């Protein structure tokens, strides 16, 4: 094949708890790899490799971090902060895999 991702990374700005297989769930702060934007043809999602595994993940939740490509290997790390906030995050947009 003669296709390519983006590979650029991204930012969680909130967190999420997934409801579909394919969905990825995360917390405020993870980092993720993003492949590629509106993938499946599902407006504001994206798809993402985040612990180890692949699917997708609202945008907007996220911030997208361009940059070089590294030729050594990345090593992110995170704890499991307590919140204490009743500040909700933006919804995550529609899943509906063709037209509305």
Same mark, same amino acid.
């Given at each position: 094949g003669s296709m390519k991702y983006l590979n650029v990374l991204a930012?969680?700005?909130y967190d999420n708890v997934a409801?579909?297989?394919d969905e990825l769930s995360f917390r405020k702060g993870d980092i993720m790899t993003?492949?590629?934007r509106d993938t499946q043809?599902? +407006?504001?999602?994206?798809?993402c490799s985040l612990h180890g595994r692949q699917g997708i993940v609202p945008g907007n939740r996220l911030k997208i971090l361009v940059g070089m490509y590294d030729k050594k290997p990345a090593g992110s790390g995170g704890?499991?902060?307590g919140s204490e906030k009743? +500040?909700?995050p933006?919804?995550? @947009? @529609?899943?509906?895999?063709?037209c509305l």
């Open positions: 930012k969680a700005l409801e579909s297989p993003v492949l590629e043809g599902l +407006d504001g999602w994206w798809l704890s499991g902060s009743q +500040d909700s933006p919804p995550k @947009p @529609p899943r509906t895999r063709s």
